[PDB]
Design a protein around this nucleic acid. Structure first.
Ligand SMILES: [Fe+3]
Length: 145
DNA sequence: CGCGGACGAAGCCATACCATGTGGGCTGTCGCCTGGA
């Protein structure tokens, strides 16, 4: 791995998220074939050369599984889009309370995505307490992004 | 009218097949008669 240095400190949450990372990679390469796939160029010995090679071949193509697995505006919108670009300095939360069916969605992904750029993470996630809303806005809201 | 005895009102509950070794305690026998010590 290149003999990394020791980190002077760590905290719980960091260890939790990176634990999700490690278990993710484990389950990742874990899948069956794989296994059978590369089950042809087995290492003959354990010297640094052969292990460097095998590790280097996984580095050659791991993204295979990655992509193979799939991984007139209203007043409110004008006021948030108007003044909010000054307040968007970093991580926080925006609680929006708009009338039913008025279009709170537009301001939701507008500000949500501007702030996503402010924090630097493209993907998002919406939790809805129904079932048909997922299957409807899944497409309704996908072809514009 | 004054009252005995009996019940009921709840707070409670609880994703990376296999094994056993142990012991010991109770019973009475003759050939009889003469001779010598
Ligand atoms: Fe593993």
């Amino acid at each position: 791995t290149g003999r990394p240095t020791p980190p002077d400190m760590l905290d719980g949450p960091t260890a939790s998220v990176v634990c999700g990372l490690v278990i993710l990679a484990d389950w990742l390469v874990s899948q069956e074939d794989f296994l059978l796939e590369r089950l042809t160029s087995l290492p003959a010995d354990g010297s640094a050369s052969a292990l460097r090679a095998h590790f280097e071949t996984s580095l050659r193509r791991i993204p295979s599984l990655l992509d193979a697995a799939g991984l007139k505006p209203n007043g409110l919108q004008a006021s948030l889009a108007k003044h909010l670009p000054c307040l968007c300095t970093g991580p926080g939360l925006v609680l929006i309370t708009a009338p039913m069916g008025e279009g709170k969605t537009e301001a939701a992904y507008h500000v949500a995505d501007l702030l996503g750029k402010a924090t630097g993470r493209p993907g998002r996630f919406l939790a809805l307490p129904t079932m048909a809303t997922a299957d409807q806005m899944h497409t309704r809201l996908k072809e514009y992004a």
